[PDB]
């Protein structure tokens, strides 16, 4: 990648004689991404629901209307249906796909050119426009949109607000934005996980 010490790389190890199953890629990815969103939805009715005033008028006769339970089947705020309910259904899976997925994508994103550095120096691993000296001297610029992972807290209080890119620290999975984007870099072949 660089010019300072080395100048050469590239790999398709993962499993290149395959890397062609978009079908499943679509389905699952979408599903988990949703999950998270703090689901705490309310509910109102059942039997009493805040102990009701206790019935009313007779029936046979009544004020013209065979009905008389203050279950409140009409008040805008009374005996309806349980659409929501706290449990916003929490479903999920393992690394069986955590890997396979990021593979075909970036691998295809390499059929467009991604980049990978793995480890380097940008400057004072803190200031915005310090890393800028690494934007016009690296190559990248406004359009394709890029993502990158570096586990050093130095880069953390450095990348701050990332207009155009990601800025990560530990081990997440933000292909989301990368799907609608491209460019990338990793923290050692070790971090991707062996």
């Amino acid at each position: 990648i660089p010019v300072l010490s080395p100048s050469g790389r590239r790999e398709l190890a993962a499993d290149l004689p395959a890397e062609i199953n978009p079908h499943l890629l679509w389905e699952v990815v979408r599903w988990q991404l949703a999950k998270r969103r703090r689901g705490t939805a309310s509910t109102k009715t059942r039997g009493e629901v805040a102990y009701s005033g206790r019935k009313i008028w007779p029936q046979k006769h009544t004020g013209r209307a065979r009905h008389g339970d203050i279950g409140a089947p009409i008040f805008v705020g009374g005996g309806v249906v349980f659409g929501p309910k706290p449990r916003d259904y929490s479903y999920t899976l393992p690394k069986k796909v955590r890997k396979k997925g990021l593979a075909m994508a970036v691998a295809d994103r390499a059929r467009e050119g991604k980049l990978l550095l793995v480890e380097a120096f940008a400057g004072v691993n803190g200031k915005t426009k310090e890393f800028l000296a690494w934007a016009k001297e690296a190559g990248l610029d406004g359009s394709e949109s890029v993502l990158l992972v570096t586990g050093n807290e130095l880069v953390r209080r450095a990348a701050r607000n990332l207009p155009w890119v990601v800025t990560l620290a530990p081990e997440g999975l933000n292909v989301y934005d990368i799907v609608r984007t491209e460019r990338l870099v990793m923290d050692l072949d070790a971090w991707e996980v062996f």
Partner: protein, 146 residues
Amino acid sequence: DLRPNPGANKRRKRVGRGPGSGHGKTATRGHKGQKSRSGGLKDPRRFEGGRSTTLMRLPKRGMQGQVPGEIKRPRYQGVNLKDLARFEGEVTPELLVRAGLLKKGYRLKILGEGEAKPLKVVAHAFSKSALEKLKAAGGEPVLLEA
């Protein structure tokens, strides 16, 4: 790919439903002559019949309904030769099963069909098929003991 018409690999459909309208089947239900439906619904399993539901039978199995438990005899099981014919190393009753397939056992009974590579596989109770497969054709162990 990206964010372009991700239309979920062919067959996708959320196949919900709805209240009603005036376009077809919709906004009906379907029945009447048989009075189903209940605000606190039937269930609805197979409680119907209303005819002893072909349950004019009788309990035969007398291996239950006591009070504390049931019979207790350490894992009584078996095996085949075609399942691990693979390799050997030693074919130990834990090298395999303790690591891989099949659960616990104080009494391992050997058998199956096939005809693979035989050799001193430990066992706690054998089957004669093995005996001839390993009488100048293989080697065997002993049993439990404690």
